Design a protein around this ligand. Sequence first.
Ligand code: HEM
Ligand code: CL
Ligand code: MG
Ligand code: MG
Length: 153
Amino acid sequence: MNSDEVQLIKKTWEIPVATPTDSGAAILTQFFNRFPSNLEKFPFRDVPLEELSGNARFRAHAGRIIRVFDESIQVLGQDGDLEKLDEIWTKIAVSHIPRTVSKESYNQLKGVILDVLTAASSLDESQAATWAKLVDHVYAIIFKAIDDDGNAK
Ligand code: HEM
Ligand SMILES: [Cl-]
Ligand SMILES: [Mg+2]
Ligand SMILES: [Mg+2]
């Protein structure tokens, strides 16, 4: 990723990261609206869709997605970037093994994250592609740590 691309990610991230609560809720509500089976993994599985963002555990997970991306973006373009991303995302992958989060489930979330960011920062196609390169990189890291069903390899 060239220096222009890193800068673009950093600068466009400033908008959605300014509001972790709303931005994370946009991601996670969309995930559950499109792909409701994923609700069942959480303790808030029976909370009505319109009430999800009021649930504290929903808010915690929503905020985690934003914060982990923020941590990831912070390391870009500087020494140790690849190592630090591998660390971050390997740990995320292993953390979900006890919840059998499948590769399909991750891929469901992937498209929703990119959708939310594209809208939030008004990304053009080229800018969205730069974001997709980052996300695909981190997904490579996740996916070398799990089988298709989300178990350890
Ligand atoms: C960008 C992707 C994601 C990130 C960064 C993320 C991050 C996290 C983190 C940091 C935790 C806390 C782990 C702990 O208890 O120590 C967590 C828990 C959890 N995540 Fe994710 N997650 C992601 C995607 C997903 C997906 C796709 C699902 C699918 C349903 C999911 C389901 C869960 C569940 C069920 C928990 C445990 C909740 C509980 O124990 O009450 N996550 N996630
Ligand atoms: Cl579903
Ligand atoms: Mg297996
Ligand atoms: Mg099994």
